[PDB]
Design a protein around this ligand. Structure first.
Ligand SMILES: [Ca+2]
Ligand SMILES: [Ca+2]
Lengths: 160, 157
């Protein structure tokens, strides 16, 4: 089979451009640097690696889905603690994808990005394969969506 | 808010549908050759690829004519070859740290590219004004997400 199994987590900040415009570039560079360090550290704690990041978005790879979910939960908790300003959406999907360079390519990379794009600020959504892989962490009963660039319907599950 | 820089974004129109159509094997081959093409052409105009992810590139140039020429050669090259790519170009101060670019003008460049049609090179008004060899349309006025008001964007003819 083409490619290797990987669990891909995408995250990005809700309305980051408006935030940047509000607080100005000096404050934004500090904010996004602090955020990057936060994400990086929490990823490393779950034996993940940040594959790509640009602006307010990150693509992260894990070997096991429980690591990816644990990382998301800790990130959302950490962001809530900080707020006591920044909300992030998190999406997780797993499947085979092709490593080329220090990037990942293939339909399951794109799918992971769409699972994330479906998530509200403050929310962690996972694809059905992730939910099913973790069925033995708690999930809602899912909602049915259609993902940009893909035919058919997909059920996405919120982490509780 | 950092050094003056010209920022070019490009990305493939509906790459996901494309991937699903030809399959991963074919897609990885396609995007690998596309990456080679873009990298080649950027270097030809003294640009520097700052970030690339999936079907997209963020590119830095010193001068707006370099960015526009690069965009023109890339569209021409792609025609000689199906994929359509959006190209957007903006200029302004951006913070350049750790081999990356930060700030509102990076976001603005991405918004300009996102407004471009496949096969189009769209530039912001500061880029058009700096180039006053290169011909533009009369512009179109649009809202860009995250920014207040409207912006006039100009296609390269
Ligand atoms: Ca965002
Ligand atoms: Ca695209």
């Amino acid at each position: 089979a083409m490619g290797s199994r990987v669990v891909i987590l995408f995250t990005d900040i809700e309305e980051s451009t408006a935030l940047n415009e509000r607080i100005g570039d000096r404050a934004w560079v500090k904010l996004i640097s602090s955020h990057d360090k936060l994400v990086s550290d929490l990823v490393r704690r779950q034996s993940g690696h940040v594959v790509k990041s640009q602006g307010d978005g990150f693509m992260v790879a894990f070997a096991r889905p429980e690591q990816a979910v644990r990382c998301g939960i800790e990130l959302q908790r950490a962001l809530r603690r900080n707020a006591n300003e920044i909300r992030v959406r998190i999406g997780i999907h797993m499947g085979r994808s092709v490593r080329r360079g220090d990037d990942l390519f293939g339909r399951n990379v794109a799918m992971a990005a769409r699972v994330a794009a479906q998530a509200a600020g403050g929310e962690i959504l996972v694809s059905q394969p992730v939910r099913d892989a973790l069925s033995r962490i708690r999930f809602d009963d899912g909602r049915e969506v259609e993902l940009k660039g893909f035919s058919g319907t997909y059920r996405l599950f919120a982490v509780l």
